[PDB]
Paper text:
Here we describe a systematic approach to generating modular and rigid repeat protein oligomers with coincident C2 to C8 and superhelical symmetry axes that can be readily extended by repeat propagation. Repeat proteins are composed of an asymmetric structural motif that is concatenated several times in tandem within a single protein chain. From these building blocks, we demonstrate that a wide range of unbounded fibres can be systematically designed by introducing hydrophilic surface patches that force staggering of the monomers; the geometry of such fibres can be precisely tuned by varying the number of repeat units in the monomer and the placement of the hydrophilic patches. All multiplexes follow the naming convention CsHRN_Rr where s is the cyclic symmetry, HR stands for helical repeat, R is the number of repeats in a single chain and N is an index to differentiate between multiplexes of the same symmetry.
We instead adopted a ‘Lincoln Logs’ approach that alternates non-polar patches that favour close subunit–subunit interactions with charged polar patches that disfavor burial. We hypothesized this would generate offset arrangements of the monomers, generating fibers with empty ‘pores’ in the regions of the polar patches. We generated such fiber designs from the C3 to C6 designs described above. We characterized the three-dimensional structure of two of the fibres by cryoEM. As with the bounded designs, the cryoEM model backbones closely match the design models. Like C4HR1_8r_shift, the pore size and twist closely match the design; the twist is −142.8° per monomer, or 71.4° per repeat. Notably, C3HR3 was verified to high resolution for the bounded four-repeat, bounded eight-repeat and unbounded fibre designs. While the radii of all fibres are comparable, C3HR3 has the largest repeat size; thus, the mechanical stiffness of the monomer may be responsible for the increase in stiffness.
Residue numbers in the entry:
A (entry chain C): 1 to 465
B (entry chain A), C (entry chain D): 1 to 159
Write the structure that this text describes.
């Protein structure tokens, strides 16, 4: 009698009705007949396990699952569907009465892509991989217990199909213990986070990217539980110390989303330089707070910190107790940006110069020895040259080419150091003349560019002015 | 109404949205409007050459190209953007239905350094050189014919 | 972790990588390990003088200087390289923070022949002559004041 009820519930669905009508027209009636035979057999295989019948009702009421089943019975792979329903029956039986775990199954099997992936994994004769994976699910769910935040994170992580594929791949390779260790690390991360919406939100965001999850699995595979635990502790501390300020939390979410920054953070948390990362996050907080809501400076900070090499340089410099050098450098950058105002062509040169990591290392070196006014006057001379370029774009293009080179910038800082500032000024306007004399004859501009761009001829030319 | 489609596809990109927000912040309200006027003009210059407007949907939906265009409209070189979009149109109509040649154009104009170099060469009133060079590209493509190894070398060497 | 940055920057150079691989082949692995130990020791002997770390990042990046250092570590002259790096550290520390003088040192030590002559002159236990000569360089640079003609002539003559 239950089979007739299930058949009726399936047939009364309008989408199912339209699909069945289409498949009746196209001559595939025996495919529908085989599918209903499989449904009857699945009901008879469930028997007195009424929770399995309640699962099948939900699974077949969904029209997309029914459409996938029709496509998969058509091509003669109905035995794959029988094997899948047998495995699902075994998984629901072995759980017994864990209603939260059966709720997780009712959720995961309703999602079409998960059902398609499971069908594909049951076709190629890898049934034990699905069995082991459902066992791991039940185990992690029982371990979670009275801690609904962790079960919510687990449900969200499993709903993502890419993470589901990664989990199936790692279970296939018999890395089950690595997966168990990872869920234990998630448990001892959620327990530590407690009720704090920002930290739980950061976990919910970060753990959802496949790259970060793959990196985490690749580190816990080599028995590195302490590394991951201390990294989550450092992130919790960074959120707690951040206070209420959206612009810092945004940078944390961004930088931690970037995979290579997360790799560098793991490498520096392993070697017991944890307090270095703490002080670095403090320095970022100070830079953001002292840089107000000025969007130009904030964008410059985001571009500078998003680049991994500059991030590593900053880590190495806070490592050896020179945090105040980084602070003074960010102060000089903020000062230079404030004098730029809305003159976007000049701010573009700050973006180009500071985006080059070698020039950032040189600037940190030049600020450390307390020559900061040299850098200040050099930025002012760059402004007093760009503002004099006016509307002549080949000059500014030559200047973009010239200042990107690290050794030319070093030589310019050297000539500003020894008190010959005016000569540097006289150089830049002189270049303007060679442009204005050049006009539109690109061969002369090309020759001038080949004479300017190399360091030795540059230092020679600086000596003749 | 394809202009509205272009606007939606352009502002949908998050980096483009960030750039536009920044350019609204620092007090350059009219520069975004001038750029969108140039975009509207470029759309209505294509007319029924739907492949050209598809090429514009490609080019303008790239953060680097769009930022370069904004900065290059800033300091009064607006017309340099109008001229360039004209010449590309001349390159597309004269190119005809050689879809592989339009593929090479899509590849080349996506690279920001190529687009900046072309902006420099159209700025100083050497547009004829860019037009002749696109003609050389078309001719080398037709001469190469259906022989994809040579077209791959051509793509790499011009990239 | 600065030492790791030096190792990565050194091994990024293809020529240095090939030299290391070749010396791995011939059964001289402990010579490469001893050289890296000397590098570590000189770095941690430099301390918080980041200018000295920059000098080591420059001098050791050069492939010929690395080759000469490796060959001098081969035949049992490790202490000679250690003494030379110590003397360079002392000349940078006593040199103060005159950036032009440190530029002269960065120039003169990048030249391979000057480095080989200094190694030969530290080998024979004449350590103080090198330090005295660096003192003479410091004095001549500080006496030149701001007059780049003379500093250019001096760089040329000492090169």
């Amino acid at each position: 009698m239950v089979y007739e009820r299930l058949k009726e519930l399936i047939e009364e669905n309008p989408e199912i009705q339209e699909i069945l009508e289409l498949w009746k027209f196209i001559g595939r009636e025996d495919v529908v007949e085989k599918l209903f035979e499989v449904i009857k057999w699945a009901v008879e295989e469930g028997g007195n396990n009424m929770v399995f019948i309640s699962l099948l009702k939900e699974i077949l009421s969904n029209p997309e699952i029914f459409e996938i089943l029709l496509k998969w019975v058509d091509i003669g792979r109905e035995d794959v569907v029988k094997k899948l329903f047998s495995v699902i029956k075994q998984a629901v039986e072995d759980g017994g009465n864990n209603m939260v775990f059966l709720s997780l199954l009712k959720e995961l099997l309703s999602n079409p892509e998960i059902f398609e992936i499971l069908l594909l994994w049951v076709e190629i004769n890898r049934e034990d991989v699905v069995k082991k994976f459902f066992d791991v699910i039940k185990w992690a769910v029982e371990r979670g217990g009275n801690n609904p935040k962790f079960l919510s994170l687990l449900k969200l992580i499993l709903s993502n199909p890419e993470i589901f594929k990664i989990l199936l791949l790692w279970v296939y390779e018999n890395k089950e213990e690595v997966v168990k260790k990872l869920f234990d690390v998630l448990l001892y991360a959620v327990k530590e986070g407690g009720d704090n919406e920002k930290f739980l939100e950061l976990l919910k965001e970060i753990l959802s990217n496949p790259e970060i999850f793959e990196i985490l699995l690749e580190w816990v595979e080599e028995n590195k539980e302490d590394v991951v635990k201390k990294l989550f502790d450092v992130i919790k501390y960074a959120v707690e110390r951040g206070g209420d300020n959206e612009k810092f939390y945004e940078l944390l979410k961004l930088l931690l989303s970037n995979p290579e920054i997360f790799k560098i953070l793991l490498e520096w948390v392993e070697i017991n330089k944890e307090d270095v990362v703490k002080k670095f996050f403090d320095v970022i907080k100070w830079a953001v707070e002292e840089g107000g809501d000025n969007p130009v400076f904030y964008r410059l900070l985001k571009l500078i910190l998003s680049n991994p090499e500059i991030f590593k340089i900053l880590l190495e410099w806070v490592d050896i107790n020179n945090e105040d050098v980084v602070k003074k450098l960010f102060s000089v950058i903020k000062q230079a940006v404030e004098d730029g105002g809305n003159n976007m062509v000049f701010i573009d040169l700050l973006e180009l110069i500071l985006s080059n990591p070698e020039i950032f290392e040189i600037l940190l070196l030049w600020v450390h020895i307390n020559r900061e006014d040299v850098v200040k006057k050099l930025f002012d001379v760059i402004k007093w040259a760009v503002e004099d370029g006016g509307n002549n774009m080949v000059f500014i293009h030559l200047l973009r080419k010239l200042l990107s080179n690290p050794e030319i910038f070093e030589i310019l800082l050297l000539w500003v150091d020894i008190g010959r500032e005016e000569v540097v000024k006289k150089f830049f306007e002189k270049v303007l003349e060679a442009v204005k004399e050049g006009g539109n004859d690109m061969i002369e501009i090309k020759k001038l560019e080949e004479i300017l761009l190399d360091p030795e001829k540059f230092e020679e030319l600086l000596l003749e002015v």
